[PDB]
Amino acid sequence: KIHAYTEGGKPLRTIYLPKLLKKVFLDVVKPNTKKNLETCGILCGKLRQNAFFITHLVIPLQEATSDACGTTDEASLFEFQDKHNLLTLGWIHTHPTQTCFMSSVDLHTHCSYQLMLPEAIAIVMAPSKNTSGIFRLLDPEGLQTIVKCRKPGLFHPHEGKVYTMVAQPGHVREINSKLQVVDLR
Ligand SMILES: [Zn+2]
Ligand SMILES: [Zn+2]
Known part of the structure; x- marks a missing residue:
């Protein structure tokens, strides 16, 4: 039994993540990664x-760049999520x-x-360098920094520690659950 907490003490509910998800997603978007x-x-x-x-795993209509x-189409995704009573995690x-x-x-x-969901996670695939990582912002020091950050230019650096990695074990917990990919394109 795990209880995780935020930098400021808020308790973090567990997120159950399918072990298959990462490779399944990497497979589904292989057309873009082989195309870099x-x-x-x-x-x-x-x-x-x-x-x-x-x-x-919902794959939205999107515009992909090297960076x-x-x-x-945020609307097709919302329709889909509303239809099937699905929250964004x-x-x-x-x-x-x-x-x-x-x-x-x-x-x-x-x-x-x-901000919508304190427990929310960002998963990052580096398929060339053969690595992945599950991250979140620091709550509140890191959210504060990015909410104040109206500074311009898209690679703009940030003051002090801004994000961290959900820990092992953690509030993110990998399991052998069934998985559905929904490609909206
Ligand atoms: Zn990125
Ligand atoms: Zn910024």
């Missing part, structure tokens, strides 16, 4: 008995050649995730 392109996908699922279970990859994306780390845009993106 960033591909993101949304981690959805249910609140059941005070924990979150990730049940769906970022936002969603480009985080997201995952590929760094095709780059290392395993949270880029500057990656922290601004995750910031609005972790």
Whole structure:
């Protein structure tokens, strides 16, 4: 039995993550990584008995670059999530050649995730360098920094420690659960 807490003491509910998810996602977006392109996908699922279970990897309509990859139809995703009663628990994306780390845009993106949902996680694939990582912002020091950060330019550095890695064991907990990929493209 694990109880995890935030930098400021808020308790963190567990997130159950399918062991298959990471490689399945890497497979689904292989067309972009072999083409050296960033591909993101949304981690959805249910609140059941005070924990979150990730049940769906939703791949949104998106615009992929070598360095970022936002969603480009937020409405089709919301329809889909509303239809199937699916909360957002985080997201995952590929760094095709780059290392395993949270880029500057990656922290601004995750910031609005972790604001909606304190437990939210960002998963990062580095398929060339053969690494992955599950990250979150520091709560509150790191959210504070990124909410105050209206500074410009998309690789802009950040003051002090901004993000960290969900720990092992943690509030993220890998299990052998079934998995559904939903490709919205
Ligand atoms: Zn990134
Ligand atoms: Zn910034």
